[PDB]
Ligand binder design. Structure first.
Ligand SMILES: CCc1nnc2cc(C)c3ccc(OC)cc3n12
Length: 113
């Protein structure tokens, strides 16, 4: 029950804030299927920040949950595919942790709309 333009402005800002937490840029683009030939074997829906940006601008995120769901996919896919003693796994835990406050604050603002 809100206006489209301010909401998308809020999602854009939120997405940039989330991306800022990924300092190694390991989640910026789709996992390279050419480099990881077995990836799709147990990852049913790959996700990444570039794809999220495309979805946002394609008006595919019209509520906060659908945005947050794809962010959570970035994290959960990474935890699933990689062993716990890897940099990738711990980077996903860190993103989940730091992304948490970013999402909570952004949703607060959305609920004012
Ligand atoms: C989030 C990126 C990712 N998640 N799991 C893996 C596993 C692998 C193997 C992987 C390899 C290269 C790479 O460049 C971004 C990302 C990779 N990766």
């Amino acid at each position: 029950e809100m206006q489209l333009t301010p909401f998308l402005i809020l999602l854009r800002k939120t997405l940039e804030q989330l991306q800022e937490k990924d300092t190694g840029n390991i989640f910026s683009e789709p996992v390279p299927l050419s480099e990881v030939p077995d990836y799709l074997d147990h990852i049913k829906k790959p996700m990444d920040f570039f794809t999220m940006k495309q979805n946002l601008e394609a008006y595919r995120y019209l509520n906060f949950d659908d945005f947050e769901e794809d962010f959570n996919l970035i994290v959960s896919n990474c935890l699933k595919y990689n062993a716990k003693d890897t940099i990738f796994y711990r980077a996903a835990v860190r993103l989940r942790e730091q992304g948490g406050a970013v999402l909570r604050q952004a949703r607060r603002q959305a609920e004012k709309m």
